[PDB]
């Protein structure tokens, strides 16, 4: 029906993603780098795949 904004579409461009690019240049960030030390594993395979 009618909406508050005339433009809606879908596309894909979150404002939070822009921070990830500046975050990478600023520091490694990684999964955890602020809370207390905890048992965790960071596997780094030579090749990554989205489908298998």
């Amino acid at each position: 029906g009618a909406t508050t904004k005339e433009k809606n579409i879908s596309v894909d461009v979150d404002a939070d993603a822009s921070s990830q690019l500046l975050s990478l240049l600023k520091s490694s960030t990684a999964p955890s780098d602020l809370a207390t030390p905890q048992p965790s594993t960071f596997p780094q395979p030579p090749v990554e795949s989205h489908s298998s």
Binding site: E6, K7, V13, A17, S18, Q20, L21, L22, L24, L25
Partner: protein
């Protein structure tokens, strides 16, 4: 999840530097050892800048960056150079 800069190579983005100056262009490269970013701007000019002078980064909207409009613009409808002997107005088919 998380991606590297290689996915954002060729991306048009704007960057504010430590000196409060702004500059936007389409990325062409980034070197890990020195962190050095080449930007190819749409005015046919290349510019190499070292990322360490970046104070902040942002991706610009696709197309219509300078001009402001409120239309979907499904087709570019551009005819720069290359001209033929046929003329088209609005749409080839109407009420079809």
């Amino acid at each position: 999840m998380g991606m590297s800069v290689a996915d954002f190579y060729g991306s048009n983005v704007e960057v504010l530097l430590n000196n409060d100056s702004k500059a936007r262009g389409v990325i062409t490269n980034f070197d890990s050892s020195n962190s050095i970013l080449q930007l190819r701007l749409a005015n046919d000019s290349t510019k190499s800048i070292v990322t360490k002078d970046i104070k902040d980064l942002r991706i610009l909207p696709k197309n219509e960056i300078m001009p402001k409009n409120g239309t979907k613009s499904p087709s570019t409808n551009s005819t720069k150079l290359k001209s033929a002997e046929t003329y088209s107005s609005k749409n080839k088919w109407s009420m079809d």
